């Protein structure tokens, strides 16, 4: 079916412009659809921004009057979003979504891209290993963690053992303080499998091109 995917700078300076791209695969953008831009604010309110249909016809929400521009490049089968004069109020998750012009069906959304409007500086994170205390390793289950601290902006991706370990994992939302984010993740495995089977935290922060692969070492002799 039709698949959409956003891309574009995740951080933008106030009063500058936001510029996103949506690549469509499995369907020509010059057919049947209406390509929309929709954004979700931190509170979870959705706002329709606008669209450009299969024939190039556009339409945008009056709430953005003059700041929005929606275009396309048929040779590349992509449509774009441009929002100028941004402010922190434009900070939100952006989505592109296709809907049939005829009935508004077959709605397909991209994975969504987060865009932060700030003057703060990009900072890579410190990935700290969370090794369990001796006392809490004698049960049938053991819980380990990983602490990603001091990064900006969002997001970061975190997996365990390159994604081969997904059961019993809890990755919490990041908390912001002083223009810096902190996030944690926990993973629970059968105690007898650790430390025999190593457990590694894989963290990536695209904004700073940084990657960390921290193996959790047991407290005590290693």
């Amino acid at each position: 079916r039709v698949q959409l995917q956003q891309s574009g700078p995740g951080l933008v300076k106030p009063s500058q412009s936001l510029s996103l791209t949506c690549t469509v695969t499995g369907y020509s953008i010059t057919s049947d659809f209406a390509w929309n831009w929709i954004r979700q604010f931190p509170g979870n309110k959705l706002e329709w921004m606008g669209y450009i249909n299969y024939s190039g016809f556009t339409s945008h929400n009056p709430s953005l009057k003059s700041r929005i521009s929606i275009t396309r490049d048929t040779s590349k089968n992509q449509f774009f979003l441009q929002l100028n004069s941004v402010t922190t109020e434009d900070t939100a998750t952006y989505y592109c979504a296709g809907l049939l012009w005829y009935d508004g069906g077959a709605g397909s959304w991209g994975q969504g891209t987060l865009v932060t409007v700030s003057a703060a500086k990009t900072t890579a994170p410190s990935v700290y290993p969370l090794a369990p205390v001796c006392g809490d390793t004698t049960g049938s289950s053991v819980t380990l963690g990983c602490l990603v601290k001091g990064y900006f902006p969002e997001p970061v991706t975190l997996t365990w053992n390159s994604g081969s370990l997904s059961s019993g994992v809890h990755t919490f939302p990041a908390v912001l303080q002083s223009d810096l984010y902190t996030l944690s993740s926990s993973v629970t495995v059968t105690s007898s499998t650790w430390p025999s089977q190593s457990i590694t935290c894989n963290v990536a922060h695209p904004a700073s091109s940084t990657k960390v692969d921290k193996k959790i070492e047991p407290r005590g002799p290693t």
């Binding site: 979870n44 329709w48 069906g105 959304w109 601290k149 939302p173 908390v175 944690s184």
Partner: protein, 219 residues
């Protein structure tokens, strides 16, 4: 601007039971060609909204048939014959009949299950962070229910509330529980100054709190 009002704001449902949510628009959504541009979308935790119902009463592409949209004019209803854990998330209604198109504020569907006490784990600052002059003590309160819980920190028996940051997760669709993370951040100098660190969790599953501690310099 057409105002889309959803209700209830939240809703708790036991697996297997039916669910019904409403959406009322400030203007009729029927057009000049007999179509009603009313859609229903579900947004699971961390995912992007996804199609459910379109054209007011028609089931969208690939959507399970447990979903049923109904109504006309300004009152619409979404019914789930029988709820499954994977239905948890936020439900939205959207209208494409009046420019500009608007969304409802959403309805959060929560799965109701048997109470569950949290699994508490406490972690000392790592060696690496210690070399940076900072010291974070982390505590995980995992897979509990209901979602209401309280975490208290204690340094050498004394409670500590400054320097604590918390984060919750959405409800998990695999077991319908919640999880929370609490972090106490101190300076390396202050951490190195005390001995015991305690993470106290109080949940309705027990009259007395679940306590986890460790002594600095002890495995």
């Amino acid at each position: 601007d057409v105002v889309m009002t959803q209700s209830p704001k939240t809703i708790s449902v036991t697996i297997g039971q039916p669910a019904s949510i409403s959406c009322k628009s400030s203007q009729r959504l029927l057009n000049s060609n007999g179509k009603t541009f009313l859609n229903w979308l579900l947004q699971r935790p961390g995912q992007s909204p996804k199609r459910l119902i379109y054209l007011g009463t028609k089931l969208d592409s690939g959507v399970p048939d447990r979903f049923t949209g109904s109504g006309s004019g300004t009152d619409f209803t979404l019914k789930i014959s029988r709820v499954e854990a994977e239905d948890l998330g936020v439900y939205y209604c959207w209208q494409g009949t009046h420019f500009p198109y608007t969304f409802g504020g959403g309805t959060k569907l929560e799965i109701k299950r048997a109470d569950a006490a949290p699994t508490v784990s406490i972690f000392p600052p790592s060696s690496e962070q210690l070399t940076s002059g900072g010291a974070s003590v982390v505590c995980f309160l995992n897979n509990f229910y209901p979602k209401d819980i309280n975490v208290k920190w204690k340094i050498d028996g004394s409670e500590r509330q400054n320097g604590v940051l918390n984060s919750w997760t959405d409800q998990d669709s695999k077991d319908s529980t919640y999880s929370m993370s609490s972090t106490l951040t101190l300076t390396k100098d202050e951490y190195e100054r005390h001995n015991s660190y305690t993470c106290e969790a109080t949940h309705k599953t027990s009259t007395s709190p679940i306590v986890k501690s460790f002594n600095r310099n002890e495995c």
